[PDB]
Amino acid sequence: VLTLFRYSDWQDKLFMSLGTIMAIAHGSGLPLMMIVFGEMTDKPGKILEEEMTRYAYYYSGLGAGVLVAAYIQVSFWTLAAGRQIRKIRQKFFHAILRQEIGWFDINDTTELNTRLTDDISKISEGIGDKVGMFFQAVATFFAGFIVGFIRGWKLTLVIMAISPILGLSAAVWAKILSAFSDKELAAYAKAGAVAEEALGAIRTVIAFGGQNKELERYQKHLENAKEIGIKKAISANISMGIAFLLIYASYALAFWYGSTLVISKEYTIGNAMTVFFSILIGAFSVGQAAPCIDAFANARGAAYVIFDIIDNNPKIDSFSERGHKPDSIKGNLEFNDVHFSYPSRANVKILKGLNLKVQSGQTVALVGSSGCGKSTTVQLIQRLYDPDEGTINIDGQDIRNFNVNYLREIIGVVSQEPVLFSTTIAENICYGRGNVTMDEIKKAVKEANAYEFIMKLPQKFDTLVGERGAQLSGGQKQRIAIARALVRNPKILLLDQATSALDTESEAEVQAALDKAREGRTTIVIAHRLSTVRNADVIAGFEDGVIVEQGSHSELMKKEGVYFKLVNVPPVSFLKVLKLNKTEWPYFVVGTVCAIANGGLQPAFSVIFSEIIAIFGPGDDAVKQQKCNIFSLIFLFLGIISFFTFFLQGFTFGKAGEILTRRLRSMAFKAMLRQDMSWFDDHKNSTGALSTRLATDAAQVQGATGTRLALIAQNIANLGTGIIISFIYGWQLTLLLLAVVPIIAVSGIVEMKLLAGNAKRDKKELEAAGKIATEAIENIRTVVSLTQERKFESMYVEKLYGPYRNSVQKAHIYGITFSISQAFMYFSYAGCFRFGAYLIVNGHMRFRDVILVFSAIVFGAVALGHASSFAPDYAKAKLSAAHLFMLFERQPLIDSYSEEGLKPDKFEGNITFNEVVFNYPTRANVPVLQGLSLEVKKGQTLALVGSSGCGKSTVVQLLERFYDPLAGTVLLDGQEAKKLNVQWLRAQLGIVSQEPILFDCSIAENIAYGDNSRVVSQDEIVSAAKAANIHPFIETLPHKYETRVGDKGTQLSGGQKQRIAIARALIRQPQILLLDQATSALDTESEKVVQEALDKAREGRTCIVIAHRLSTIQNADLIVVFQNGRVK
Ligand SMILES: Nc1ncnc2c1ncn2[C@@H]1O[C@H](COP(=O)(O)OP(=O)(O)OP(=O)(O)O)[C@@H](O)[C@H]1O
Ligand SMILES: Nc1ncnc2c1ncn2[C@@H]1O[C@H](COP(=O)(O)OP(=O)(O)OP(=O)(O)O)[C@@H](O)[C@H]1O
Ligand SMILES: CC(C)CCC[C@@H](C)[C@H]1CC[C@H]2[C@@H]3CC=C4C[C@@H](O)CC[C@]4(C)[C@H]3CC[C@]12C
Ligand SMILES: CC(C)CCC[C@@H](C)[C@H]1CC[C@H]2[C@@H]3CC=C4C[C@@H](O)CC[C@]4(C)[C@H]3CC[C@]12C
Ligand SMILES: CC(C)CCC[C@@H](C)[C@H]1CC[C@H]2[C@@H]3CC=C4C[C@@H](O)CC[C@]4(C)[C@H]3CC[C@]12C
Ligand SMILES: CC(C)CCC[C@@H](C)[C@H]1CC[C@H]2[C@@H]3CC=C4C[C@@H](O)CC[C@]4(C)[C@H]3CC[C@]12C
Ligand SMILES: CC(C)CCC[C@@H](C)[C@H]1CC[C@H]2[C@@H]3CC=C4C[C@@H](O)CC[C@]4(C)[C@H]3CC[C@]12C
Ligand SMILES: CC(C)CCC[C@@H](C)[C@H]1CC[C@H]2[C@@H]3CC=C4C[C@@H](O)CC[C@]4(C)[C@H]3CC[C@]12C
Ligand SMILES: CC(C)CCC[C@@H](C)[C@H]1CC[C@H]2[C@@H]3CC=C4C[C@@H](O)CC[C@]4(C)[C@H]3CC[C@]12C
Ligand SMILES: CC(C)CCC[C@@H](C)[C@H]1CC[C@H]2[C@@H]3CC=C4C[C@@H](O)CC[C@]4(C)[C@H]3CC[C@]12C
Ligand SMILES: [Mg+2]
């Protein structure tokens, strides 16, 4: 209960304590004034005027006191909530970056950004101003009790006898509501994980036609969250129904008991009515604080998962400082019987006792088959996992003894398929070490041979690399990764196929630079080519995860081992949002009629009190008991009907809001899966930004469209009925009562114009924080391997500073507006007493009519606080609704959901390019293609040959129809590709990407994703697996086709996911194959087995090959050489 306030500082405790005592001082005033008011109620034309004027002095002073008490009440709670929400946001991201990679494999980490955004929003709604308004209502209730015990003590015990039942019911239903809040929250987090997985790899979802599959996977969780939110609303309104049932039933009991006392004259008329009126003010106030109770229960439910992640502790601690930092390390490295298994597949033994010995100054070279443990050996050097039954030594001393940061900073890796970050080129090379000068950057870039194209691009070292490097080619991204590793100047260099996507001349220059550089660093080389493996002093060969083969080139060539075999924004009206749920108009009708019939009843008690005071007059005393029994039956039946009407309005409004939220979330994701690749290449649209938008916009709409509308319709009916009753009984005073309406209206106008202005900047800056959070979570291998986690926490905090200041300004603006609203509501009483004195002494109205109007106005003074509490939600609801509708009304150029276009029945695999000129929209000044002419007949094989960065993957993107050419014609089988239906077009193609990526599902589903719109059978999956040469490994695994591949294929090796990408292409039986270096992480045996099945499958269809081999280019039918983006 106080774990929400576990992170409260001393200033936070001071703000919450002063806000608590000022809210206790603020609420207790209304009932306590009744003791001085109730002494003239039981009642020459000057003494009454003096009493009225004196009470006007009291009320004006009370209003002045309320002006500063309500200000401090709101402002200090909102300042404290802003400060501790800032530090919870910092500590949760620090706790995510602290954990080790064994935690990132066995847990769900695409769920964390959605969990972050939506839970911190729920906690900010929960621990803020709602708690202060709750204390205000509690102080009002107990001040009514104090007034009751001063005036008449036998009346207040009968009503105090029910308050533990109200506390019991509120605690029970708040505990149930916190449980359902956690259950609903988990479902929305699963849906956000589906969306963030689908938007991260968007090129494969577009190219394989998987929009409907991802949309159905999203809607499967939206339906569960809907069905939890409905019964959440059921419990949340059984609570208020039981509360008001107890209120009116106990008031019936107390009124029947007070009947006998007033008739037997033990009390007078004045002592009973003050007790009744003060207790009804308090009892209505505690009932209105029930939404604040529900909001606190929701925050308590959200905090469960966030606090645990902070509590969890890693065995390999990244931030700790408890290890040796020796001054001089010669690069000796040695294994001693290393046994290892990954924690996600624990029962598959991988290293079975390895004995490697690397001397300081020489390099080794790891050869072997695919899937034997080479990059596992590389991952155990930098201590990402601990081995099960072994030890790894550097210069005689164990790696478990070193400081983890010092180890990971003295060694420098190159990953297999390297991943850049979504910042500039010089920023990636600065992420390399951390404090680099430009001399170091330019020398390392020349040493990695990346200098010519960086000089060639405009804004040379400032070109924004796309998300994961997607705005660069495959041989430019890898040279930037080589330069990134070289700026560190490591003592131990790890090269895991660093030249896998470079052509032969650049491989020669890179290997000459790396060979010239070595003086005192050890190097581990995993070689793509076995022609440069001969320049190694030691060669290690893996056979079932051990070393059976070690020595020099001729030493292992005369040995007959494994190496021998290898060598041989427009605003939107809110009725436009409520135009979407036209279908449940009976829900809004029943909710609005019950809200009117519930809000009207609070001011009607003045007329009931007038009839009570008139019915206790001089009589025969046998009739007044029989009339007062009729009044008590009326209060009992009013209690039963109030139970039914409160339940109906709340449940009815809540169900309609859940339906609208489900429709808005699915419409937003369906309309986000629709835009073309230029919308995703826009630098504002990262997947972190796009996954914060789906969690913010519909949630901000739901927060103002839920049961809050039922409560505000109730409060507006309350304020209306007060004015109507006032006009009937005295029309002269009611004009002054309505005279404040211009001032409260202008204050509402000014706070709406300021809260709509700062919610804009809040929404603008939370996406820029969520971008950093998502890239640092989803590239956690490279983050941990480079030790830039301190820098990413620093960046997240300095992007998180902004909404703190926005919360400060929101606190002051909303506090001033709530303050002057409550003060100008309490000055109306002083104006009413003075002007009513004037009217009574001139003879217009009467004293009981002045009492009647005053009594009717007190309940509206209750309702204004909740209307002002609703007012800061409507601004962010309007803003997020404008953003949702501009997303819904955006229409792309290449429309993926269109049903019109030519859909020919028979397709001959003929393609033709007639002088295609194309520039990318992000860098639209550089020419990529400069008029491209190539024609491929049926059954031919086009081979694309060129240097690195010539436009070989651009033609695959143009044939896949992501992009439109500027001036040129892409035509297929005679007819132009713009005329064809784009889903038909993308279904006729079969594509293997350059660095392929998978999904976080099973191998059977990743292979069956290759052809949608039909249930692909298990026999077809097994046949494509046998053709792609993966079925021996799949049969070896303990789960055969149900081993869950990790996020983007990280729980497999390079060759295995290359091979599942080839099977995913080949399962659809395409008409044309697009193979963009389809065999680049495979060895010679696997590549020659794959190529035979590809050759027997290519009989009768066309294919386009982009492969850097002399074996697959030479047997091709056409050979195309690129120079300056043209064909030669
Ligand atoms: N994160 C992981 N979780 C579970 N198993 C894994 C993980 N990474 C790899 N494996 C498994 O470990 C075995 C060894 O794969 P490994 O990554 O060592 O291949 P490799 O021969 O080093 O080639 P590469 O250099 O492409 O990684 C594979 O069978 C793979 O299925
Ligand atoms: N999404 C993009 N936005 C802007 N420019 C891009 C984008 N993708 C690629 N480029 C640019 O296009 C040029 C060539 O792209 P492409 O990836 O087709 O070359 P490539 O021949 O595939 O290279 P490699 O053979 O090394 O894989 C590169 O200079 C690259 O900077
Ligand atoms: C008499 C009543 C109306 C006024 C009560 C005075 C209160 C509201 C004033 C007096 C002293 C003030 C504190 C003095 C010191 C600081 C440290 C500053 O870094 C944060 C604000 C904070 C914590 C102030 C908060 C407001 C404060 C506590
Ligand atoms: C700064 C504001 C918010 C604090 C509210 C202060 C409360 C506790 C004060 C404000 C007005 C005060 C009342 C003013 C008049 C009198 C009449 C006297 O015969 C009995 C006490 C009584 C009824 C006071 C009780 C205490 C009181 C209600
Ligand atoms: C009637 C008058 C004298 C009452 C005094 C008003 C005092 C209590 C209010 C008005 C201005 C307020 C300060 C305005 C600015 C901030 C900055 C914020 O980061 C810390 C709280 C702090 C410092 C507020 C503390 C409380 C404060 C000092
Ligand atoms: C929730 C609980 C605490 C509230 C229970 C309230 C009960 C005790 C009160 C509410 C209405 C009251 C009844 C109101 C009217 C009359 C009619 C009279 O001819 C007999 C007594 C009788 C029948 C009262 C008996 C006591 C009574 C039933
Ligand atoms: C729900 C809101 C909008 C309508 C409020 C009207 C009802 C609930 C209130 C307002 C005036 C009240 C009436 C005032 C006068 C009397 C005369 C008495 O001999 C019987 C009870 C009776 C008839 C009261 C019953 C309830 C009553 C009719
Ligand atoms: C008994 C008296 C005080 C009740 C007064 C009712 C007042 C508080 C309510 C009733 C209708 C409300 C207005 C309804 C419409 C809007 C448009 C909104 O974009 C700005 C606020 C504004 C202008 C509201 C201001 C506050 C308002 C005028
Ligand atoms: C809620 C606010 C806006 C209402 C305004 C309150 C003040 C300014 C109003 C309300 C009652 C009014 C007073 C009512 C009666 C009289 C007696 C008359 O012989 C002189 C004017 C005088 C004294 C009025 C002056 C203005 C007055 C004091
Ligand atoms: C603190 C600021 C916002 C207050 C602004 C409103 C002030 C100027 C107005 C509104 C209500 C007015 C009070 C209403 C009633 C009367 C009774 C009369 O016999 C003496 C003047 C007196 C007591 C008025 C004094 C001035 C007053 C308090
Ligand atoms: Mg390429």
Coordinates of N, CA and C in Angstrom, one line a residue, residues 30 133-134 136-138 140-141 244 247 279-290 862 866:
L30 N -16.8 23.1 5.4 CA -18.2 23.2 5.1 C -19.2 22.7 6.1
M133 N -7.6 14.6 -3.0 CA -9.1 14.8 -3.0 C -9.7 13.7 -2.2
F134 N -9.2 12.5 -2.1 CA -9.7 11.5 -1.1 C -9.6 12.0 0.3
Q136 N -9.5 15.1 1.3 CA -10.5 16.1 1.5 C -11.9 15.5 1.8
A137 N -12.3 14.5 1.1 CA -13.6 13.9 1.3 C -13.7 13.2 2.7
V138 N -12.6 12.6 3.1 CA -12.6 11.9 4.5 C -12.7 13.0 5.6
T140 N -14.1 16.0 5.3 CA -15.5 16.4 5.3 C -16.4 15.5 6.1
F141 N -16.3 14.2 5.9 CA -17.1 13.3 6.6 C -16.9 13.3 8.1
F244 N -24.0 3.9 -1.8 CA -25.2 4.8 -1.7 C -26.4 4.1 -1.1
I247 N -25.8 4.5 2.5 CA -26.0 5.9 2.9 C -27.5 6.2 3.1
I279 N -24.3 15.7 8.2 CA -24.0 14.3 7.9 C -24.3 14.0 6.5
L280 N -25.3 14.6 5.8 CA -25.5 14.4 4.4 C -24.5 14.9 3.5
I281 N -23.9 16.1 3.9 CA -22.8 16.6 3.1 C -21.6 15.7 3.2
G282 N -21.3 15.2 4.4 CA -20.1 14.2 4.5 C -20.4 12.9 3.8
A283 N -21.6 12.4 3.9 CA -21.9 11.1 3.3 C -22.0 11.2 1.8
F284 N -22.4 12.3 1.2 CA -22.3 12.4 -0.2 C -20.8 12.6 -0.7
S285 N -20.0 13.2 0.1 CA -18.6 13.4 -0.3 C -17.8 12.1 -0.3
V286 N -18.0 11.2 0.7 CA -17.3 9.9 0.7 C -17.7 9.1 -0.5
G287 N -19.0 9.2 -1.0 CA -19.4 8.5 -2.1 C -18.8 9.0 -3.4
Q288 N -18.6 10.3 -3.5 CA -17.9 10.9 -4.7 C -16.5 10.6 -4.7
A289 N -15.8 10.2 -3.6 CA -14.4 9.9 -3.6 C -14.2 8.4 -4.1
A290 N -15.2 7.7 -4.5 CA -15.0 6.3 -5.0 C -14.2 6.2 -6.3
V862 N -20.1 20.8 -3.7 CA -19.5 19.5 -3.7 C -19.1 19.1 -5.2
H866 N -15.2 17.8 -8.5 CA -15.0 16.7 -9.4 C -15.1 17.1 -10.9

